[PDB]
């Protein structure tokens, strides 16, 4: 299954280097800028790579919803995470001409009783989400737990 698509050559190369180091089989889709990898490893690998910093309405909505769902699924592969919800809020093509807008994301996680996300895991989530959405800076990702505690500084 596709690990990543639409990668820069630089990111692609970095991702391939990491996969080789981890001894994970991979197949870079020919001229598809995509890297199909073991289906059962896709989510774990996305997270791991994120930790190392790598890399119509209905459709949009659907797309957005699909993206949200995928991101949630990936985040749920983290050990301490029981469930995750991702909400993406990219304003519709800035109607206002002068004012400038920017995409943001809100991530809510339900943690396993007695478990917490560490700083690394938190950073991985933030990176994963930011990388998935064009123009979404890490700073515009808010990560909260079930109790509403802000995890992202």
């Amino acid at each position: 299954r596709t690990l990543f698509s639409n990668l820069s050559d630089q990111d692609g190369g970095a991702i391939v280097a990491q996969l080789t180091q981890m001894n994970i089989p991979y197949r870079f889709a020919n001229g598809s800028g995509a890297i199909e990898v073991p289906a059962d490893k896709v989510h774990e690998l996305r997270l791991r790579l994120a930790q190392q910093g790598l890399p119509q309405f209905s459709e949009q909505v659907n797309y957005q919803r699909a993206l949200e769902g995928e991101l949630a699924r990936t985040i749920e592969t983290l050990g301490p995470v029981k469930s995750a919800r991702v909400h993406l809020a990219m304003p519709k093509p800035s109607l206002f001409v002068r004012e400038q807008k920017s995409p943001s994301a809100s991530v809510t996680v339900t943690l396993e009783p007695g478990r917490a996300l560490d700083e690394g895991q938190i950073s991985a989530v933030v990176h994963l989400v930011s990388s998935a959405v064009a123009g979404l800076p890490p700073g515009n990702v808010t990560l909260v737990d079930q109790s509403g505690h802000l995890l992202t500084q």
Partner: peptide, 27 residues
């Protein structure tokens, strides 16, 4: 410039007060 920094400071304070209220009002 500085006004935007002050406004962001106010927004963060308001958001944290909101979250503190929500935390106890949730259970």
């Amino acid at each position: 410039d500085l006004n935007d920094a002050q406004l962001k400071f106010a927004n963060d304070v308001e958001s944290r007060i909101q979250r503190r209220i929500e935390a106890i009002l949730s259970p």
